[PDB]
């Protein structure tokens, strides 16, 4: 069920106040550290010797309540960007006063508001804080979808509110936001409270909150309706903002007092758990990635590593994708043997990368579903699986299949093959390198023999995500480039991300490939009409491949194949963010290079505005031979 | 059967003992095989009696004539019969006494005591009628590689190990042990044989592929030879007046050798490990090895 | 209870092997990957082609299974380290392949032994393997903790056991370690399984593994004697040995067979269960420290910083140390207002670095219980803890306490004090500035006034640890000098650690210092007998405190406090390991320096060999004032 | 694994003790290969491997000149550069006498077996320029009775004390890597303000040709020298002798060091630590030279009389490219 908070303003007793909104059933309370309405001299006396105490003690609640359950507020009276330079002092004063508070009782997390276009002296003294102490805080900034001035009741005679259409302006609330977020130079502990008013706004302006690191909704009372017995409810197109933010996995916030006296206060909030409980329960692949969404992990390298038992664990435990390559088999085999000769023809069929040998189980019924004959090779490189697969070998499938552990480069088979079958695809199609492997193999296939899977090609779109730039950022390493991170791709579940463009394809294959001057290096130029107000962080990668005829396998979100769990998109990410604005193209330049050794991809942007060309000579990331 | 066929021994009748060990796939165990038609084995189908043992067998020997010794990865020391007139091999007993794989089994010369050498260091006097031990040397400092008692004298054996000592035995003495080492930093010992006729002399193979002669009493390398390219896993002499000897090796080729440690027969007919010979009683001529490429190979000697 | 393994070299099934092993009771099994007698050719055919399979399937156990419960074993052939150029060769591929197949199944730990002196090439290999690959794999190296040369009968007439004093020889196998841990550069990943025979050797063998990572000791079934009944038990020094062990937290391995055949093979487990079950229960200070244990930290400066509402809740939640603070300042009351002036003399009582308020709620209870009057003063300078402070005096404590918020340097106080009270003590007496504070606190003190601590000295004692070495070491951060973590004390409860000589005084500060020319800067020279073999780390730090009197507290180990958990012991480590031989000194040198600004230790070892001077100009670690 | 600028090639050919020591050779070979009365009907073949900008090929010239015997020279060289001088050099000069192979001899497909190749491939320590890696892909186009100028070379080491040297290798920290990568790798310096202590021993040898079956350039040398002064060993030094021809040989090693001779300084291997000697002890230290299908590289370790880290593990701060 859901996450939620309680917010307040009035606390008179603080431990009768937590143990009512316990009983509510919120998870935890926001609450203001100091009075709001006290307000406190710093600079002139005599206010200054002010006798106190200042605030409660800290001995009301006890550590672990503090640590869990209390989010601090500060105070409303605070204004650190005023114009008057006596209240930005006093206020830079108070501000410190009340964040230093909150870290000396330990609070998982602090309220600031963003009300205004300037917040500069804010993120000053907000940065300085954080820069100063050995905490281990969190800084939720309140921001409205709406501002409210743009909220208003138009009952201003003399100054109404105008009914033209303003697309940048309806996104000024983002801006505060991505002005604050840059000052403070993208620190991790800051992120976004997004509260909610009664009017939603256009659909781009809730689409320039994707990608952005939001911890908390906020839903004032106000803007729930009434149904007939009297509950507490929300329109439809609130429900469906909730549902957005339910997959985000945010927490919810309650603030404003209870305006259906006749129901609990819990009512609100089982509203909210009555929408979670009654959404699509998860499938399949949404269970096993959940964990894993927007998590970095460096890409595989089957061909210079020896995979371990677990990975490919993970990859045969995919009942969709060994479906498929049994179905192209089957089909290739009805195809290459006519009934007559179903007998008297004995295909050969060789898996070039046979793992712990599924493509071999999956040949196996391929020839038994479709009534022909196969003789069967499964060439593996890593020893640790070949003893796996001669284990198989010995018990099971018999001298039907012939266990060859070598490189199928250097292998020197003894007749040549029908149909060779790999799976050699990494989440970018080419990124571990398929092609230079196949081109090696092709060698010991017949003048007319077939490749399983015979295409394959890779996809890029421009995406904008403010958390996966600063996971990026933050994968920074002693004894290296300090900017490698983000020279180097990752295979991750994109979870909070913006797409902003539709995916184009990028390098694609063939096998065989008969050409004579055969050179799989690329130099790919791609155009992306951007629609919307963005920010670039960089390209999620993804690949569709032919098996054989209209047997295909896609990772591309459009075409994605239902239910496959094998590969995760890739991401290729860009030191500097790109601001894109509506109308503007993004084009990007995609490179596939290689010497005798390496492979490697480089990349640049270079419209609007031109980046740097990412990983040259491969200096961050190779893939070997 | 297992893969690995690791002890091939005649009987006085002329029958063939097999002993053999799992060493790869999901089940480590061993067998034990008696053939009254010896060149029917390896093959299953067609021997006289067969067993299998809870885990694999790493030396194997006589007692006499219906009593087999065998050693086991288990570190257990076993003792069966051959029962029901020759087609039953039962389990006289099985005793687990050293604390890790039991390597080398060796029946002294009275046949009711036996010694074993394990991997744990120990070396081990075995009464084979009361089933007990009697004694327990701990005289080397690393794992037992060989055992091989007199022919003759069942209170003195020979014993080498990979702390590089070859130790001549005689319970009779308080310190029993005694080290007799040929020049100084020789190479690990690995394969011991005493001389059928030519008593306090024998032969030991090094890890290096070397075969050396030893006089005991003189106590100085009179000879030795380069035989093997490989370790020496094992060394046996012919039933002959002038005895010829056998020499086993890691290089998959066997050789015999005269008494001055020439190269006279070799046989790569094997395509991994050699692991033992036996020469046959009623044919003095024919030499029957046995190996991990499961082959029982029968060569004639001129 | 004791966190059990079972060895094996024979495994048969290992499906019913892991299932006996944990119906005996075991954690975890020892096992080869590879039959043990099942040795493989490489370079020489024709073994080198020998057909497969080459060892079972990984299939046969979970991956669950093979993370948790399976320990591996390199097989006993392999020698890599042979004089035999082949077997070097041979071996060298062998250990490699057994190596990666234990990473393949993702191992928790994998078994190599140390037999002899040279293990140089098998200390490449591992070092190797160890920064290949991108596993997570930890190695116990096996170590006999007496050699078997050294343990066996004398039963060979020629060559007898030479029944001779030898010291450093008996310690042999300690060497053995200590050269292979130090060709793999102090490899985190790589441990101690310590062996135990029949004969244990001399108390120094036994210490010369203090401070040593053994994750495991393995016990033999040969070394168990038997009582009346028929179970397997344990001689009285063995019992102890198993104490000691049971207090370094190591998983313990039974290996052999069972020589006790009338009782079951749990038999030799429960006793080791009924040793840890049937000892001294844990105490308050082991129970709270249980977890602490050899858990570096950066010392607090509550001077530099304001300290967080848990952190003085740990320095209240210790009831010893308040009530040696009360029995101070009950007998200074006593001794300086005579029985007939209880009335007429108030005694004025400033508590210089309250808190949350302990030592003033300590000094009511002194006044009520010693029958005079106080005046209190509770001056912080920690605005957050004035907070609690302030909340105090207003609910209970009333107008006898006046709460002074600002430093004590600083504070202008309407009169001067009778007592003044503080504990602006640190894990090295002044390593958090007391001296500093109550020399500007001086100033407000009567002429005959007392200081509760009127004394306090700093101890010092030269330690071994590996341990503690490696964690330093790994301390090592980006954006700063790669080996400043080395020229900084840490305090932590130090737990696998040997000390190798006595503690001795280093520096003493004495409360009120009327001295004209006050100097707090410290140059002090100290001569460590040691006579043990040993190899130092770095230097342990305690202190002792006179309240008053013969009132003290101390957390130097020979007269420590009882049960008085507030402070850990400071360690001061040094960049490179200093080798010293049994009768030798170990000469050090400490400095307190200090500005008007900052205040720094030096120190440097100058016997028997020479450090680099640690922490010039206190570059890595300064004390603010 | 990199091609060599011009003036690099230009310190290498103005030597002339070492090239007069290469025409001996070839010149003594000539004549133990042909007989005088064969001297106009055999025409030996002989290619150099690693020809540069052609110093070595105007030795050949020399060398048959001066025996009075016919020979047909390949040029071979993988530099491109310095191909262009070769050309120039053959169409100006040379004449179709010489045939300029511009490729890898490891690649190479040679219309003809060479009876003599000829090569300069050798480094400060002998090996450490992949010369071995080189001769055994060119092994295939040499006669079964060919001869390899040089046919042998062995690197040599000696412990040195130098608190300079050491400081200078300390100062070569950089950022973007391991802080200590510095002390983990070989430089080619003319060492200087040094001590040796102890006389330099064989480390590696390599012959060729190598006509081994089971051909494997991996090394495992472990080395004693006695030390007869109380000193602090901060590296190693490592030299070279090399045999050309019989008794033509060149040498590096300052004991046997060819007189004047300046195309290689000494190699200088260094440790992290500092470790202290006193007189009569024993420096031992071991060597390795690893390899797979990529990089070759050496690591090293000191076991005697106390034991330092093993330096330079799977390359990680020091490879030599194939
Ligand atoms: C599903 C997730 C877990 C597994 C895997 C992954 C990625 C990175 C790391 S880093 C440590 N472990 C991992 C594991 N992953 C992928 O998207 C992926 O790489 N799939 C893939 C690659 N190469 C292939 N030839 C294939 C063919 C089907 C066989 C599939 C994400
Ligand atoms: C007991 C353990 C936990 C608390 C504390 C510690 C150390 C480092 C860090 S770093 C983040 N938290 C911590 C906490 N610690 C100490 O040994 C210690 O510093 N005691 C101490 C210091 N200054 C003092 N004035 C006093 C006086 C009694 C008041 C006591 C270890
Ligand atoms: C004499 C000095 C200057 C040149 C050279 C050197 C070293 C390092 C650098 S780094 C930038 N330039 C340089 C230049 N050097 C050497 O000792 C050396 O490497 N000689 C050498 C190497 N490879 C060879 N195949 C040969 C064969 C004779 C051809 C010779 C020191
Ligand atoms: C199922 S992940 C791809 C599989 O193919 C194997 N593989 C990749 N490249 C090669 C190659 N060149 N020769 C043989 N197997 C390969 C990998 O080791 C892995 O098992
Ligand atoms: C109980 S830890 C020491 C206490 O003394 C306080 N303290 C340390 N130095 C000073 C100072 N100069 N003036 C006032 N309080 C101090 C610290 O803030 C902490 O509460
Ligand atoms: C004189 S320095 C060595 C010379 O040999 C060349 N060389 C080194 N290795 C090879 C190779 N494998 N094939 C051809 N030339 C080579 C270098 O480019 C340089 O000119
Ligand atoms: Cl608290
Ligand atoms: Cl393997
Ligand atoms: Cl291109
Ligand atoms: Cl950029
Ligand atoms: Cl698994
Ligand atoms: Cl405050
Ligand atoms: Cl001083
Ligand atoms: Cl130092
Ligand atoms: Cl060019
Ligand atoms: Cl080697
Ligand atoms: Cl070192």
């Known amino acids: 069920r859901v996450s939620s908070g309680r917010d307040l303003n009035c606390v008179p007793e603080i431990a009768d106040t937590l143990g009512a909104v316990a009983k509510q059933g919120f998870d935890f309370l926001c609450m203001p550290v100091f009075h709001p309405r006290f307000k406190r001299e710093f600079i002139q006396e005599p206010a200054k010797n002010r006798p106190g105490p200042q605030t409660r003690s800290d001995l009301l609640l006890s550590g672990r309540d503090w640590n869990t359950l209390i989010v601090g507020k500060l105070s409303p009276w605070i204004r650190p960007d005023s114009k008057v330079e006596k209240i930005r002092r006093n206020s830079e004063a108070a501000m410190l006063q009340e964040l230093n508070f909150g870290a000396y009782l330990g609070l998982p997390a602090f309220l600031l508001p963003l009300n205004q276009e300037d917040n500069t002296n804010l993120a000053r003294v907000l940065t300085n804080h954080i820069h100063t102490g050995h905490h281990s805080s969190m800084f939720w900034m309140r921001v409205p979808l709406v501002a409210p001035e743009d909220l208003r009741d138009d009952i201003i005679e003399n100054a109404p509110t105008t009914h033209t259409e303003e697309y940048s302006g309806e996104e000024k609330t983002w801006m505060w936001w991505h002005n604050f977020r840059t000052l403070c130079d993208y620190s991790k502990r800051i992120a976004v409270a997004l509260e909610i008013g009664a009017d939603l706004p256009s659909n781009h302006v809730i689409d320039r909150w994707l990608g952005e690191p939001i911890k908390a909704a906020i839903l004032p009372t106000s803007i729930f309706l009434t149904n007939k017995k009297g509950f507490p409810v929300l329109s439809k197109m609130h429900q469906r903002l909730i549902f957005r933010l339910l997959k985000l996995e945010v927490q919810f916030i309650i603030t404003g007092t209870n305006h259906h006296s006749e129901k609990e206060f819990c009512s609100y909030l089982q509203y909210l758990e009555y929408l979670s409980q009654n959404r699509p329960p998860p499938n399949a692949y949404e269970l096993f990635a959940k964990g894993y969404e927007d998590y970095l992990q460096s890409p595989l390298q089957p061909l210079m590593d020896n995979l371990e038992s677990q990975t490919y664990e993970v990859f045969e435990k995919d009942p969709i994708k060994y479906s498929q390559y049994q179905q192209a088999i089957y089909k290739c085999l009805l195809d290459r043997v006519p009934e007559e000769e179903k007998d008297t023809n004995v295909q050969v069929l060789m898996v070039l990368g046979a793992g712990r040998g599924p493509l071999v189980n999956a040949s196996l019924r391929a020839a038994k579903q479709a009534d022909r004959r196969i003789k069967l090779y499964a060439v593996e490189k890593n020893p640790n699986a070949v003893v796996t697969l001669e284990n198989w070998q010995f018990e099971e499938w018999g001298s039907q299949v012939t266990v060859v552990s070598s490189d199928m480069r250097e292998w020197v088979a003894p007749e040549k093959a029908d149909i060779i079958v790999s799976e050699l695809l990494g989440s970018f199609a080419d990124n571990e390198l398929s092609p230079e492997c196949l081109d090696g193999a092709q060698h010991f296939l017949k003048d007319d023999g077939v490749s399983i899977p015979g295409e394959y090609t890779s996809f890029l779109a421009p995406i904008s995500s403010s958390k996966l730039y600063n996971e990026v950022r933050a994968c920074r390493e002693k004894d290296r480039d300090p900017e490698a991170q983000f020279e180097m791709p990752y295979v991750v579940r994109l979870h909070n991300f913006h797409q902003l463009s539709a995916p184009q394809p990028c390098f694609t294959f063939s096998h065989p490939n008969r050409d004579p001057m055969i050179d799989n290096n690329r130099y790919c130029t791609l155009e992306f009409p951007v629609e919307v107000n963005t920010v670039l962080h960089g390209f999620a990668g993804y690949f569709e491949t032919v098996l054989y005829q209209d047997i295909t396998l896609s990772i591309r979100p459009e075409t994605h194949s239902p239910g496959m769990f094998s590969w995760f998109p890739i991401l290729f990410p860009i030191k500097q963010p790109i601001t894109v604005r509506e109308g503007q193209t993004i084009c990007v330049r995609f490179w596939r290079c290689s010497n005798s050794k390496k492979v490697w991809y480089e990349w640049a942007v270079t419209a609007p505005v031109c980046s740097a060309i990412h990983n040259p000579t491969g200096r961050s990331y190779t893939i070997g031979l | ?302």
Chains 1, 3 share one sequence.
């Open chain 2, 1 to 302: 059967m297992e893969r690995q066929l690791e002890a091939a021994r005649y009987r006085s009748d002329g029958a063939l003992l097999l002993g053999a060990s799992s060493l790869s796939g999901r089940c480590w165990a061993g067998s034990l095989w008696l053939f009254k038609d010896p060149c029917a084995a390896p093959n299953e189908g067609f021997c006289s009696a067969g067993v299998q043992t809870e885990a694999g067998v790493a030396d194997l020997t006589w007692v006499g004539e219906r009593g087999i010794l065998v050693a086991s990865d288990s570190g257990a020391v076993e003792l069966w019969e051959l029962d029901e007139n020759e087609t039953l091999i039962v389990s006289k007993f099985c005793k687990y006494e050293h604390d890790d794989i039991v390597s080398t089994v060796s029946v002294l010369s009275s046949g009711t005591q036996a010694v074993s050498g394990s991997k744990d260091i120990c070396i081990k006097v075995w009464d084979l009628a009361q089933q007990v031990v009697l004694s327990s040397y701990r005289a080397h400092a690393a794992q037992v590689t060989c055992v091989a008692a007199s022919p003759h004298k069942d209170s003195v054996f020979l014993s080498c190990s990979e702390d590089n000592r070859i130790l001549l035995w005689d319970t009779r003495c308080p310190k029993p042990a005694s080290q007799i080492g040929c020049s100084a930093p020789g190479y690990l010992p690995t394969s011991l044989a005493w001389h059928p006729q030519q008593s306090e002399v024998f032969v030991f193979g090094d890890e290096n592929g070397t075969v050396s002669l030893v006089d005991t009493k003189s106590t100085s390398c009179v000879l030795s030879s380069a035989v093997h390219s490989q370790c020496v896993t094992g060394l046996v002499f012919s039933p002959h007046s002038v005895p010829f000897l056998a020499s086993l090796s890691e290089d998959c080729s066997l050789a015999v050798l005269d008494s001055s440690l020439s190269e006279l027969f070799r046989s790569q007919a094997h395509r991994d490990f050699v692991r033992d010979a036996t020469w046959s009683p009623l044919n003095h001529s024919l030499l029957t090895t046995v190996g991990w490429d499961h082959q029982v190979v029968h060569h004639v000697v001129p």
